[PDB]
Amino acid sequence: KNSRIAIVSADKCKPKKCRQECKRSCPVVKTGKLCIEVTPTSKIAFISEILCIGCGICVKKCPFDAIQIINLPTNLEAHVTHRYSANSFKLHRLPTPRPGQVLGLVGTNGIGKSTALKILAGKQKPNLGRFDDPPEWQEIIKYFRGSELQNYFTKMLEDDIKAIIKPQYVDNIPRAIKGPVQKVGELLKLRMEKSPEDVKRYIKILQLENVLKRDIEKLSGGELQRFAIGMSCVQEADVYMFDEPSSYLDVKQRLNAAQIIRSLLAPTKYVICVEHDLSVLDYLSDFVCIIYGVPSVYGVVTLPASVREGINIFLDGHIPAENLRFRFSYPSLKKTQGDFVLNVEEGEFSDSEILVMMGENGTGKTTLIKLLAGALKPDEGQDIPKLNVSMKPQKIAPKFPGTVRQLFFKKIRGQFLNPQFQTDVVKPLRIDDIIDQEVQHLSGGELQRVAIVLALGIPADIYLIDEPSAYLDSEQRIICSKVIRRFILHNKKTAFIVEHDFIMATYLADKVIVFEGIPSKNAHARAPESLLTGCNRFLKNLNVTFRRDPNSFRPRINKLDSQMDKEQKSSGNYFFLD
Amino acid sequence: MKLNISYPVNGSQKTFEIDDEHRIRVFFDKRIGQEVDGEAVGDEFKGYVFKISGGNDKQGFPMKQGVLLPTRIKLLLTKNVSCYRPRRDGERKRKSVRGAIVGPDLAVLALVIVKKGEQELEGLTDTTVPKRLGPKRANNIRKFFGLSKEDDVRDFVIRREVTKGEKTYTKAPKIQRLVTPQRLQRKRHQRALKVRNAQAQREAAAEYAQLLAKRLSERKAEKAEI
Amino acid sequence: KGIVLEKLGIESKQPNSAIRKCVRVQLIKNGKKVTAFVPNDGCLNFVDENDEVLLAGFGRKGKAKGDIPGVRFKVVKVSGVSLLALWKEKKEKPRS
Amino acid sequence: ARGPKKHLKRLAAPHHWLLDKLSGCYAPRPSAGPHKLRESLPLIVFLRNRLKYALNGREVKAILMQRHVKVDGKVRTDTTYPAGFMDVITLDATNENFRLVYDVKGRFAVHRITDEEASYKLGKVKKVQLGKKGVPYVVTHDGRTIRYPDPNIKVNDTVKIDLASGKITDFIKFDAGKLVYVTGGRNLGRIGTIVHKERHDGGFDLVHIKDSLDNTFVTRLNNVFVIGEQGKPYISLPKGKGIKLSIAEERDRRRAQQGL
Amino acid sequence: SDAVTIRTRKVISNPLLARKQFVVDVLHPNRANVSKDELREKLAEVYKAEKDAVSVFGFRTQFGGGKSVGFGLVYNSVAEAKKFEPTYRLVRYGLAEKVEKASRQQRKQKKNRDKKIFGTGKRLAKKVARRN
RNA sequence: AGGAUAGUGGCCUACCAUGGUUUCAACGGGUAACGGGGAAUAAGGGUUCGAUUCCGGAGAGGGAGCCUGAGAAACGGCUACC
RNA sequence: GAAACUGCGAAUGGCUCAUUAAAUCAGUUAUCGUUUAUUUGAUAGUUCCUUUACUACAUGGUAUAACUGUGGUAAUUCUAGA
Numbered sequence A: 001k002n003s004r005i006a007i008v009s010a011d012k013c014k015p016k017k018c019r020q021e022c023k024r025s026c027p028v029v030k031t032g033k034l035c036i037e038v039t040p041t042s043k044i045a046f047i048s049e050i051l052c053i054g055c056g057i058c059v060k061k062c063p064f065d066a067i068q069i070i071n072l073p074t075n076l077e078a079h080v081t082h083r084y085s086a087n088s089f090k091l092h093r094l095p096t097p098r099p100g101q102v103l104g105l106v107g108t109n110g111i112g113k114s115t116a117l118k119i120l121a122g123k124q125k126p127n128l129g130r131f132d133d134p135p136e137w138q139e140i141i142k143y144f145r146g147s148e149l150q151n152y153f154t155k156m157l158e159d160d161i162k163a164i165i166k167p168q169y170v171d172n173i174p175r176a177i178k179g180p181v182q183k184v185g186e187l188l189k190l191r192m193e194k195s196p197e198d199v200k201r202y203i204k205i206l207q208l209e210n211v212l213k214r215d216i217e218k219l220s221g222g223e224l225q226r227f228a229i230g231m232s233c234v235q236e237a238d239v240y241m242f243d244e245p246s247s248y249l250d251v252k253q254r255l256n257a258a259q260i261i262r263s264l265l266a267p268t269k270y271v272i273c274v275e276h277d278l279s280v281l282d283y284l285s286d287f288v289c290i291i292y293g294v295p296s297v298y299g300v301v302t303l304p305a306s307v308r309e310g311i312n313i314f315l316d317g318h319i320p321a322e323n324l325r326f327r328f329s330y331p332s333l334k335k336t337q338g339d340f341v342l343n344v345e346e347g348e349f350s351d352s353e354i355l356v357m358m359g360e361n362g363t364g365k366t367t368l369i370k371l372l373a374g375a376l377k378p379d380e381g382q383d384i385p386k387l388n389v390s391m392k393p394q395k396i397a398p399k400f401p402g403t404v405r406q407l408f409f410k411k412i413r414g415q416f417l418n419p420q421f422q423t424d425v426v427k428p429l430r431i432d433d434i435i436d437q438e439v440q441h442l443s444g445g446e447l448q449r450v451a452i453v454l455a456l457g458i459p460a461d462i463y464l465i466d467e468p469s470a471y472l473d474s475e476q477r478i479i480c481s482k483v484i485r486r487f488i489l490h491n492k493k494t495a496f497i498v499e500h501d502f503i504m505a506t507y508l509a510d511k512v513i514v515f516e517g518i519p520s521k522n523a524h525a526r527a528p529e530s531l532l533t534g535c536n537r538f539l540k541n542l543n544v545t546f547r548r549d550p551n552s553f554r555p556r557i558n559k560l561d562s563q564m565d566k567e568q569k570s571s572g573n574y575f576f577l578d
Numbered sequence B: 001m002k003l004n005i006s007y008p009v010n011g012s013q014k015t016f017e018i019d020d021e022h023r024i025r026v027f028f029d030k031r032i033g034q035e036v037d038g039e040a041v042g043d044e045f046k047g048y049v050f051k052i053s054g055g056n057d058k059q060g061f062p063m064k065q066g067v068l069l070p071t072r073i074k075l076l077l078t079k080n081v082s083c084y085r086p087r088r089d090g091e092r093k094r095k096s097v098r099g100a101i102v103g104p105d106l107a108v109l110a111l112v113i114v115k116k117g118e119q120e121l122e123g124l125t126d127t128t129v130p131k132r133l134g135p136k137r138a139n140n141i142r143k144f145f146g147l148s149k150e151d152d153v154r155d156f157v158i159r160r161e162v163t164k165g166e167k168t169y170t171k172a173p174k175i176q177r178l179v180t181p182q183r184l185q186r187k188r189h190q191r192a193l194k195v196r197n198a199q200a201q202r203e204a205a206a207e208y209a210q211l212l213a214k215r216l217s218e219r220k221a222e223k224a225e226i
Numbered sequence C: 001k002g003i004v005l006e007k008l009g010i011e012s013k014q015p016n017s018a019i020r021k022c023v024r025v026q027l028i029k030n031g032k033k034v035t036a037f038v039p040n041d042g043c044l045n046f047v048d049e050n051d052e053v054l055l056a057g058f059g060r061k062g063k064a065k066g067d068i069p070g071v072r073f074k075v076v077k078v079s080g081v082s083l084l085a086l087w088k089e090k091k092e093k094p095r096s
Numbered sequence D: 001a002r003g004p005k006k007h008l009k010r011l012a013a014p015h016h017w018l019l020d021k022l023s024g025c026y027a028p029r030p031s032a033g034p035h036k037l038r039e040s041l042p043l044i045v046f047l048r049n050r051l052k053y054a055l056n057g058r059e060v061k062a063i064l065m066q067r068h069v070k071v072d073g074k075v076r077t078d079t080t081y082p083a084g085f086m087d088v089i090t091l092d093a094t095n096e097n098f099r100l101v102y103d104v105k106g107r108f109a110v111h112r113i114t115d116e117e118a119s120y121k122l123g124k125v126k127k128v129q130l131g132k133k134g135v136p137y138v139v140t141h142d143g144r145t146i147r148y149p150d151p152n153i154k155v156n157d158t159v160k161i162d163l164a165s166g167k168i169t170d171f172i173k174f175d176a177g178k179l180v181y182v183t184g185g186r187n188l189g190r191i192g193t194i195v196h197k198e199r200h201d202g203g204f205d206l207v208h209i210k211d212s213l214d215n216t217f218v219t220r221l222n223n224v225f226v227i228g229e230q231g232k233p234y235i236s237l238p239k240g241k242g243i244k245l246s247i248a249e250e251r252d253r254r255r256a257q258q259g260l
Numbered sequence E: 001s002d003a004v005t006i007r008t009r010k011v012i013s014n015p016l017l018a019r020k021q022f023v024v025d026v027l028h029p030n031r032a033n034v035s036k037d038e039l040r041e042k043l044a045e046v047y048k049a050e051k052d053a054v055s056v057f058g059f060r061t062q063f064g065g066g067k068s069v070g071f072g073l074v075y076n077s078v079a080e081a082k083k084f085e086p087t088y089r090l091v092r093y094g095l096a097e098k099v100e101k102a103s104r105q106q107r108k109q110k111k112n113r114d115k116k117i118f119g120t121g122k123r124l125a126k127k128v129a130r131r132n
Numbered sequence F: 001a002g003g004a005u006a007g008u009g010g011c012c013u014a015c016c017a018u019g020g021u022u023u024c025a026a027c028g029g030g031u032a033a034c035g036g037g038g039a040a041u042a043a044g045g046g047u048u049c050g051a052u053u054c055c056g057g058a059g060a061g062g063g064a065g066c067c068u069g070a071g072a073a074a075c076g077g078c079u080a081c082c
Numbered sequence G: 001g002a003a004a005c006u007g008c009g010a011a012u013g014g015c016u017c018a019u020u021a022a023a024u025c026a027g028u029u030a031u032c033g034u035u036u037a038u039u040u041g042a043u044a045g046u047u048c049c050u051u052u053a054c055u056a057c058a059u060g061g062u063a064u065a066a067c068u069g070u071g072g073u074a075a076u077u078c079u080a081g082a
């Protein structure tokens, strides 16, 4: 049912004063194996993890109440809302779509969230870990009766709650539905019903005023994520869902997205977000609802918490229920397309070193990469890559039927054969499932990790990388970034890294180029200067600032205007403690 | 610091983002209520004289009236007194509130005015608010226009139209504390009722005297027989 | 309910000459060292060192059952399954 | 516990409202009124349970709120108003009139009365004192004070009240040779005229009573309340006539003779 | 169907509510159950007041079968019936239509949200608009 | 004799007196003790249980104080300290 | 007819039994030692105390929420001015 385990350290958990009863009255200590290791000494009582059966006998008769008792995460054929078949991912609790407030749903990547959202929508129905008969709603209702969803699901059965979801991926929505006409224009008009004024408010407060005359396919994923959310938003419906809305978007444009999501919530409506967030989930949701488990094996959803409190528990780890641990050169080229002026400045693209890009969505960072690789251009002059070019795509919704192993044969596993892909991930979160299994059915951070391999895979040094933070969280992001840095610094390469995330940029960065200008008009890429001044340039134009969380070193965006915000505006610094 | 000025006669008001410490060196070490000249601040407020009513310091705490000390202190606050509103009846609460001594730590001085100077301001001097609820009670109506007490109230009443678009109309205020036939009927009925009560008590006590008399006759005269 | 300590080989009284195969158990609640008999034929190989077992008394209320010195308790469940169910091949013991 | 009790459960209420154990947790607490809590009977109880006119509380409220029914010929719109002993419940439903008078078993039967009897009621005088400005006054069992009474009317006597007016139309003195009803307790809803009274200093004047069959008994004076003269009761008595048959006569009359 | 035979036992006239109240007893061999709608159709043969003016409700079948007991009402006019009959029965009869609004706990949540806002609350929205 | 209470009253003040309880078991200690209405068992007498659907009491983490109301020492009221 | 002001309600209920042994408690009195909102029934024609001018008694004054608009704070059914 669970794995009970002991924990030790406390305020004057005094082993020297106590005459150590823990050691004196533990059953495992008195049958060979030393579980609790202690003496009359200056340090703390040490107690093992693996050995401890549970019991809790030491807890009761330890003289001070130092040693508490915890329960660790393990599957026990309990609940089980759905599986696929066997040696596959399962899920246990889908829950309270509590209304009148937006519901945050957080976890490390490939944990079930998306699947749960689909289940809530009523598209990918659950099966209780069994191979069900034709529409067996009855049985599932009986299984989750005595609880809120009985009502919800029965309503869904008679479509008195109409379904809508923002999909996980972005590249699939333009390709699947080949519309008669593009733009925002008519395709939005056919989607919307609600009213004339609300749509005007949405598109206006979304600060676009760009893609009103332009086809979707041309639009970059960021301006495209935006459209996706808009299409989800205006659709007249009872239920509302946003499966990872705030990925590869600007820091300024994330907040107002959140506040447009907020628009829908109040009058007896249900809203369900998913997000891998910094501290922008402060505004997204009211009710954060963490999910734990093992990636691609089992996932359990904890009952909802307050946003503040929930984010704070996600960091340390332990909670009221369980305990999930957690913690050379290039010239000034002038490039154009149709409704754009993408200019570039001269720069020093040094050997054995990184290069950091930032900017607003539509600042031209992305097409640059395409042109460097091979697509169109130039009308006057360029510098060909010396080293073999290596490219990373943003619009990732691929199709290689069969399996991922087969697709891995197109790269090679036998180069700098000592870890590389294992150092990225192998022991804690595991890669076995990701190395097997289809790519069609794989989720965000794992699909993204597919592309992180397709980079240090074909023989190549000069590297183009834009938005790896797409569909990843603080667990998967930081270690991955560290690994990337270790790769390109140790064995002599050059890489043009482009991030929207603050931690994934600043923990790596050294030379920082800055994009500048208004979308669907202009674009200027400023030369690589210091990390401080460049970052200020990036953020002075966007008009937003951060606060380092003093205990843990973590970014927290400010509230547009505030007491500290104004000091930062007047001083200039948007990053403390280098 | 930010400033919030409001001219009471016209009913206009505006904020002013005032940076630079030398521009606001006069306001420090002063109390709420005291008059302050605007010539020392700058040229836009030259000639004006400002009275202060309240204010808010950092972290959005108000300045309590004349309570001294330029620091946030914890005070009991009851109903019918400033810087608090009670939910439950007779609920007293302790809240941290700052004094009326103006210092560096302030955020918004809630400035009012006294005298209008030589220069005219942009927003405040020009515009004037229409004062919303006009006199409801009869005496206040009579004092607004100045009608002594023999001009009638129905003809002289404050008005406001309501143009919908298709079908226009004009709803008016109800008056209270005003004479009608109905009140005169009520007072009359009250007095009459009282009179009827009195007469009924008078008539009732009379029969008691007769019954008592009869008792004295039948009983006390019967004692002479034995 | 209790854990265990070790398996025993209790030398039985006269005339009933045998070995009884009991277990020393440390409980959860007080955590007192107790001895406890294991019922049925075989069935000492089910339980191991460290294992959650729910004990019952014999019947006699305190003191020995019959021929076993010191032992005043039997068992009921081991890993929350019942020894009776295991002896009779009905149910299966979990690995953990 | 920190003030008055507004709720009231079933079971706690008296046995003589004929409240079934089931079909509810709570009972109607009688509102603060003329009569006491335990002795009296709510109007809701008189309507849905006894007369069978209304089924729910809804219906009762809908009947009461349209005036029609009235205790003492007065509106009386509240649901749980305590209608007690010897009260006239005037209804407009086909000119029906009702008097609350006790039965054999100490309950309130649906006893109809004439239109002439609806004019008046009775009342046991509980105290007689001087009010303000030396005016004497009486007080009945239902709190109906009457100003300027006759000096003959002393404590324990009965008064005939006119309803339409707060006046004393008649009074009857307390002794043997009068028809004497008895409320309260064991001998509740009986008639036996009084044989003789007993004084007892320090409260509790046990009166001796003798019914028509000469089965004498004793009751406490506080629960005793007279009615009229011998063979001339001022109110129309119900079936039974305040006699109380033994279980033998019950098994003779009520489950043998009455059958078809 | 066979026999049917409606029997309105324990008849009480109710002047104070303008109705009659009675016990509908039915003898229905060779058919499953009694059906209220059919009894509404056929109760007007004895009383004569259309259908909606009358009303009925309240039944249960006897053990075994062939018979059904029930408790019911007959109001005189339609308006009286509308105003005195409980709201839910009208829906069954098809006169009124119940506004199918939000869940009970949902309404309670709404109430709490309304408690949490002082005054009308348009001021807060306007303040937010000036802010951004 | 005052004060204080809606009030009697060592309830509390100042003065005066030397009393009150008790082995027909006070005073202390324990209670895995809220008290009753009852429950289990029953030849009769009893023995054991009664947190628990009714009455009464007490407390809303521990204590102490208080506003407001007819009514609280209230806790889905407040105040401080732990 | 939302909002707010006023008036009532929120001391009933529901929950648990930790303390508590002549204390709670049961039956049983008493308040001629008392408070009692609310129902219920009765209930102040004598206040301009110069009822000789005295101010209106065809019935008079003080404010103030919701409100319009200007904001403060990271934040709570925080609230500041005008």
Ligand SMILES: Nc1ncnc2c1ncn2[C@@H]1O[C@H](COP(=O)(O)OP(=O)(O)NP(=O)(O)O)[C@@H](O)[C@H]1O
Binding pocket: A084, A088, A089, A107, A108, A109, A110, A111, A112, A113, A114, A115, A116, A244, A295, A296, A433, A437, A441, A442, A443, A444, A445, A446, A471, A472
């Ligand atoms: N149809 C399917 N067939 C096989 N495996 C699946 C299928 N759907 C999901 N999975 C697996 O279930 C895991 C979790 O699914 P999902 O809820 O989409 O991940 P996630 O937690 O939303 N990831 P992310 O949104 O990037 O954080 C993935 O690791 C998949 O390997």
Ligand SMILES: Nc1ncnc2c1ncn2[C@@H]1O[C@H](COP(=O)(O)OP(=O)(O)NP(=O)(O)O)[C@@H](O)[C@H]1O
Binding pocket: A218, A219, A220, A221, A222, A223, A248, A249, A250, A337, A338, A339, A340, A360, A361, A362, A363, A364, A365, A366, A367, A368
């Ligand atoms: N043929 C075309 N005509 C007009 N616009 C185009 C065309 N092709 C691409 N674009 C857009 O021109 C923009 C150039 O900005 P781009 O470099 O893509 O920004 P970005 O780095 O993608 N930032 P983000 O959206 O946050 O990822 C893109 O947003 C494209 O969508």
Ligand code: SF4
Binding pocket: A013, A014, A015, A016, A018, A019, A020, A021, A022, A023, A038, A045, A062, A063, A064, A066, A067
């Ligand atoms: S834990 Fe309790 S017992 Fe083990 S050492 Fe610290 S104090 Fe002594």
Ligand code: SF4
Binding pocket: A005, A006, A026, A027, A028, A029, A035, A036, A047, A051, A052, A053, A054, A055, A056, A057, A058, A059
């Ligand atoms: S918990 Fe059970 S096992 Fe882990 S230490 Fe205390 S006793 Fe030994």
Ligand SMILES: [Mg+2]
Binding pocket: A110, A113, A114, A115, A168, A443, A444
């Ligand atoms: Mg996913």
